[PDB]
Each structure stands twice: as C-alpha cells, then as structure tokens.
Amino acid sequence: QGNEQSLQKDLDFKKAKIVHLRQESDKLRKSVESLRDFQNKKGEIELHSQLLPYVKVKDHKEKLNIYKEEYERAKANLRAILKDKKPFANTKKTLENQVEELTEKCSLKTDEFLKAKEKINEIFEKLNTIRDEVIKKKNQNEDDQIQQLLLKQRHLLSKMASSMKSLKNCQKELISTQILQFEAQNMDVSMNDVIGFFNEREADLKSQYEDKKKFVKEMRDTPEFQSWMREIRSYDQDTKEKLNKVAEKYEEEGNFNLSFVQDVLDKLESEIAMVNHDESAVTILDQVTAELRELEHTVPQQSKDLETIKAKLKED
Amino acid sequence: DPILKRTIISKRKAPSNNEDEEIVKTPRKLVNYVPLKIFNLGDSFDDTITTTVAKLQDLKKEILDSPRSNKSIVIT
Amino acid sequence: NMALHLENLKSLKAEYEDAKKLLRELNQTSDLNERKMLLQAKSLWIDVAHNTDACKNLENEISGIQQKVDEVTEKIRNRQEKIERYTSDGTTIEAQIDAKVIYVNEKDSEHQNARELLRDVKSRFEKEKKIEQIAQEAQPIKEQYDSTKLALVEAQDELQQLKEDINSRQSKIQKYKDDTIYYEDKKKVYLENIKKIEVNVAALKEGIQRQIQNACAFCSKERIENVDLPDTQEEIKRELDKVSRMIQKAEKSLGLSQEEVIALFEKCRNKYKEGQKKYMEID
Amino acid sequence: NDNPIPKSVPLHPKSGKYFHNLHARDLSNIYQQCYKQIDETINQLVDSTSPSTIGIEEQVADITSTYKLLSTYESESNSFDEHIKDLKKNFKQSSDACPQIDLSTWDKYRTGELTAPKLSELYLNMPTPEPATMVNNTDTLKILKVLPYIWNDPTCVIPDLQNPADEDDLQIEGGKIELTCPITCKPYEAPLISRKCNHVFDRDGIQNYLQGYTTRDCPQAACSQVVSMRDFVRDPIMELRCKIAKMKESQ
C-alpha cells in the first residue's frame, strides 16, 4: 500500500509535468514558425535593399525628372529676351533720332522766332524816322512839298499791319513743335528705365538658370547615385542569375503590390515585437518528444503494476 | 548584365505635357511674409498623459519607501 | 474573532504581495516609456529653435525695409527742406521785377527827353543865305542821343531776362511739389507695408509663447540638450514609432495596464494598514 | 504698328521739369510797342494838313481798319496763351489719372491693352479758340471816331456817344460845345473831365467854387449833381478840337 502511495502519486505528478510541457510545446512550434517569419526579413529587407528601396531609386529618378523639366523654363524665357535688347537698342536708336529731330527742329523754329522779332524791330527803325522827317520839313514854314511827306504814313501803317501777320504763326508753331518734341523726349526717358527693369529680370533668370544647373549637377553623383552597383554588388561572389528564386513572389509583392512608399514600416516594427519574446526553452524539444513519450508509456506500465498490487490486495 | 533587375527598375517618363505652372504663377506679394511653420511633424500619442507616466516614474520609488508586508511581529 | 480574522489578513497579504510583483514589471515598463517623452521633447525643442530662427529672419527683413524707409524719409526731409528755401526765393524775387518795371519806364522817359531835345537843337541848320556856335552847342548832345538811346536796349534786355528768370524759377520750383507728392506716396506705401508686415511678429510670437509654454509644462526646457538623437523630425518620428510599438508589446504581454493596475495597487496596499489596525484592536 | 514702339506712355516725373518747361513766349511788349506807334502817325496830321487839304476820311478809315486788325491780333494772341496754359493743366489732370508704369508692365501697355494721353492730339484739337469774350473800346479810338468830323469842322457835336447818328432823332435837343470859357477867355492848355458832367475847366482853376466846402454844382446849368474833382481825368477831345482852332485862326 506504501508502494501504491508512491507509484500513483508519482504517475499523477509526471502527468502534470506532461501537460505543463504540452503548454510550451505549442509555444515552441510558435517559436519555430516565428523564427521563419523573422527570417522572412532575410528575403524582404535584402531584396528592397539589394534592389535599393523604391523611395530611394525611383525618388532620385522622379526628382531628377522634375529638376530636368525645370532646367529649360528659365533659359527658354531667356532666349527671346536676351536678344530682344537689340530691338530695344534699335528703339533707343530711334528715340535718339527723335532727339536729333528735337535739336534741328527747335533750332530752326528758334531761328524763325528771331526772324520775326528782327523783321518787326529792325523794320521799325524806318517806322520811327517818319515823324522826325515830317517835323523837319514842317519847320521850314518860311512852297507846297507837304503832300509826298503826308503820304508816307499810309504805306508805313500798311507795312506794319502786314508785319504782324507772321508773329502769330511763329508763336504757335514753336510751341506746337516744342510739345511734340517734349512728348518724344518723354517717351525716351521711359525706355531707358525699361531696359534696366528688363536687365534686372534677365539677371534674375540667369541666376535661376545657373542655380537649377547646380541642382541638376548635384542631383547626380550623389552618395546613393555613386552607390550604383554597390546596393547591387553585395553578390560579389554569387552573381549567377540564382536570385530568380525570389523573382515571381517579390514581383507580386512589388510592381503589382498597388503600394510602394516606405511600406517597410509595416513589418520592420512588427518583427521587433514578435522577436522580443523568443529563444526561451528553444532546445527543450527533446524532452517534449522522447522523455514525455517514456513518461506516458510508464503510465500503462505502473498502471498494470497497480493492477497486480490491488489483485494481491483482493487476494488478502 | 542580368535582365530581371533592370526590368524591375523603370526609366520611362512623361516630360512632354507636364508643366511647372498649370496656366500661370501667382507672383510673391510684397507682404507675402506669412510666418507659417507653427507645427510640422508629431501628434502620434497625447503627451500630457505621458506626463502621468513621468509622475508614476517617481511615485513607484515613493511607495517603495514605506513598510511593506511581513509586519506580523506584534506580541503580548 | 482571533484565528478566523488571522486568515482574512494573510490571504489579503498574499494578494498585496501579488500587486508588488506586478509593480516590479511596471518598473521596467516606465523605464522604457520615458524614451517617448525624451524623443517628443527633442522634436519640440528643434521645432522651437527653427521657429525662433524664422522670427529672427522676419526681424532682420523688417529692419532692412525700415532702414529703406529711413533713407526714403531722409530723401523727403532734405528735399522738402530745400523747397521751402526755393519757394522763399521765388516769392521774394518778385520784388526785383516790381522794382525793375519802374527802372525800365524811367529809362524810357529819360530817353524821351533826348527824343524831344534832338529836333529842337537840330532846327538851327536853316537857310541863312568863331561861328562854331552854329553846331558845336548841339553836336556833343547830338552824339549823346545814341548814348541815351542805348538806355532802352540795356533796360528792355534786362527786363526780358527777369521775365524768363521768374518764369523758369517759378515753374521748376513749383514742380518740386510733384516730387514731394511722389515721395510722400512712396512713404505712404512703405508705411502701410510696415503696418501689413509687423503683425507677423505677433503672429509668430503668440506661437513661440505657446510652444515654449508647452515644453515648460514638461518641467524641462534646457536639460534634454544632453540627449543623443538625430536632428530630423522625420527620423525622430521613426524612433518614436519603434519605441511605441515596443511599449505596446510590453503592455499587452503582461495582459494588464500599468496605471490601472497601480490604481487598484494603492487601495490594496492600504488594505494592509486597514487590516493591521483592526487586528491590533483585537489585541 | 507691328513694332515694340508703343503709341505713348504716361508722364514720368523724372523729366517733369520739361513738362512744366513747356511754356509759350509772350508778345504783350511788341503789342504795346506797335500800339504806341499807331497812336503816333495820328497827332501830326491834326495841324500839318494844308488849308486847301480836303478829304482825309479814307486815311482815318484805313487807320481804324489797321487798329481793328491789331486788336484782333492781341485778343486771340491772349486767347492762345490762356488755351496753352489750359492744355498743360488738362495734361496734369490726365497724368494724375494716369496708371504710372514700373518694372515689366511697359510690355503689357505695348500690347495696346491700355491707353495713355497724347497732348499732341489734345492740342491739334485744343479748346476751340473761336473769337469770343471781347468788348473792345479805347480812348485811342474815341479820338478816331470823332476826329474826322471835327477836322471837317471843329464847331459841331456830330457824336452824342448814344446811337451812331445822334442821341435825339427828330429834335434840336442837346447843345453846341464852345471850348474856351468866357470867364477865363485865355486859351486852355490841358483841362480834365468828369465823365458824368461831360465838361472841363482849365489846366489850373478846377477848384473855382470852393470856400471852406470843397465841391459845388455842374459848371453852367441843367444839372442834378455836384462835381467830384477826384473823378476828373484826361480827355483827348479838348486838344483834338483846339489844335485845328489854333492852326486856322490866322491869315
């Protein structure tokens, strides 16, 4: 009976151990499949790194494209304007031609303005002496030389009446002329400023063109650009088309994935959480397979031992 | 030069119709000095609640600094 | 009564010992939690640094434009100050023409004197048929006639000179008023530019205050400088996500929420003191 | 047309000096000078004609025509001066209303999208200088309007300065004017006239009826007012009529 107290309780305890080890058997299967999922990164990370991630290679490609298409706008706008100065140079030439027109015009109308003043004044000289002559003659009272003397004033007054004729046209013409000139002069000033305004715009476009050229040059030969055949030459001793093993599945996960924008952050973190709890009882597989089997076999063994024990008990 | 890698990579492009300006560009306003940039990146989880974790950080030590269990030593 | 009450004591004591075990895990929980707070503090500080850099840029540009308006105001001041002097010259010079009109008319009158005297003196050359008295008394005055006549030219030429001078002075002086109006328009546009611009200073300052106060709410605005972390918000976000997922895994592995467990832990621990006081009462 | 040259651009203050410099010369000096001349060529012929001289009406008519031409000349010359001033005034208004150009907006105007004033045309059609706003009458012609008939015979009141023929149509109402006063038989030299009284006394002695009081009635009779000697002024008719009397009261 003491032998029974020993065998049955030990049989219960080892069965408790069997169920406890079963509680970790599923955990170890989970650990194995979890390690396989963990190694899935061996394919995933290496593949989008071997074929450097699209957010890098295609990102460089697209930014290079947008920079390239930016390359031509400044220079295109520049082609016409840089040579448009020659038309502007010719316009300035026309304006200085109108300046020469101003010079000659103003000069000759000033000349007729002097002509009018002289024609009135200098001819006024003889208009003056009429009275001196008539009074001189009259002072000889003491026979009839008075008539021809009294005739002069009529023709003299007619002469001066006719003289004032020009005055008017002369006066008006000059200003009319001057104003025309002024307007042109005015136009002239505007243009000189305009060239400057344009020239500043031209300098801006030239600077922008040089700047975008700098960005074009730097956009290539970048460390990642210099990395061509390095993210690809990590196979320094296995470049034999043997990589096709991942070809179809990675192609499905790629071009036809409908999503390729730093999608690594979906699994690169989840792998950390799952891998953070593992490697526990990894080598406890043998006990859960052979030692457990031996224990559960000695279950019938000592079960029949107890059969014979209680049979002797009945024999009492 | 293996075909598959470059097959995976792409170089075809469409620089023909795309333009930097859809029709025209809006010129910079003489007072176009809008400060902007009041906040760029963040707002993952609320942080005032994280201040609560900061408080628990020393609450744990404060509670540790006290009589704790196995004090059944009373007699007579 | 005595032993019956000694059981409720011990069972609850074991329950409290269980809560302390949970707190032991919560210790590492918090030790790893602090990382997210540190990362967020770093991000906020770098954002504030860039914001203050922007505000300094705004201050520099507004200072530059204000300096330009200062040069413009100097341009207005020096000019206008000159124009009072030119206007004074133009309004006082009228005295010259007012005093020259009388000058010219008196010159014409003194020439009229010779005009009248010449014929009178020359009327002594008549038909009569030491005799120098025939002409000598008038010959000097007869030649003086031209000396008197040139008075009219030397007066009228000067009067025309004054006319053109007054016209030119008045015109070119009054049209400095257009210069004044144009420069004043420039002053107004620049001033309204300043009025539309400066408001940005308050717009950015209210923010600066908001973020600095938010950082100060975490009882740290200077010390996190010692923390090692990339100076890029995007990368800081990636580290934040990594630590956050690690914390979520740690939280859900224990199967219990730290603060909620601690809440029950406080009362459970207090149960120890409560039970003890009444068992001393048993005494 | 089909060129970068635009029709015009609004005024630029840089050369605004030139805008204001636009200013027409003035002729008032020449006008007054020729007025003085024409006023000369009329005194001498009052006494230098011969006793047998008969007929100077055509002479005076020609002189009047010449003076009328000169009066037109000065009147519209002024008119041009004021209109020239108004031209530059209107141009200043337009400039004030002009959307001044700057930076690269000059091309946008060269597209012809917006216009700018052009004083050249605004002057080609300046405010119509039609002859108006003149009421011309001067002593210089008060003398011409009367000297022909006076020369015919000084002792005759042809002009009543009311209706061309006379004030009265069918009556002898009025009065023949005798110049030398009987109170002072001596000849006059340069007396003065009050327009309302239409009378003069002598170069000196216009203070005749003053004893304590400084004014009294019209010289002879038929008057309703006392004289105001501060209104006395030069009159040409006095010497105009005395010259022929002095010349003829001989032989």
Report what the structure shows.
The complex is a heterotetramer of chains A (316), B (76), C (283) and D (251). Chain A is mainly alpha-helical. Chain A folds into 2 domains: 136 residues, no CATH class; 175 residues, Helix Hairpins, CATH 1.10.287. Chain A contains 7 helices and no strands. Chain A is rod-shaped, with a radius of gyration of 59 Å. By secondary structure, chain B is mainly α. The longest helix of chain B is centred in the last third of the chain and has 17 residues. Chain C is mostly helical. Chain C is 86% helix and 0% strand. Chain C contains 6 helices and no strands. Chain C is rod-shaped. In chain C, 7% of the residues are buried. Chain D is built from 8 helices and 2 strands; from the N terminus they run αααααααββα. Chain D folds into 2 domains: 196 residues, Four Helix Bundle (Hemerythrin (Met), subunit A) (Up-down Bundle), CATH 1.20.120.1010; 54 residues, Zinc/RING finger domain, C3HC4 (zinc finger) (Herpes Virus-1, 2-Layer Sandwich), CATH 3.30.40.10. With 251 residues, chain D is mainly α. At the A-D interface, helix 2 and helix 3 of A face helix 1, helix 2, helix 3 and helix 5 of D. It is classed as cell cycle. Keywords: cell cycle. The assembly is tetrameric.
Q: What class, by secondary structure content of chain A?
A: mainly alpha
N-to-C span of chain A: 12 Å
Biggest interface: chains and residue counts? A-D, 48 and 47 residues
Overall 3D form of chain A: rod-shaped
* Rg for CA atoms of chain A: 59 Å
Q: Please indicate the percent range of residues of chain B in DSSP E strands (runs of 2 or more).
A: under 5%
Number of domains of chain A: 2
Radius of gyration of chain B: 33 Å
Give a count of the beta strands of chain A, DSSP E runs of length 2 or more. Answer: 0
Number of helical segments with 4 or more residues of chain B: 2
Order of helices and strands of chain B: HH
Give the overall silhouette of chain B: elongated
- Give the strand content of chain A: under 5%
Helix content of chain A: over 70%
Quaternary status of these chains? heterotetramer
User: Helicity range of the residues of chain B?
Assistant: 25-40%
Largest sheet of chain B: none
Number of strands of chain B: 0
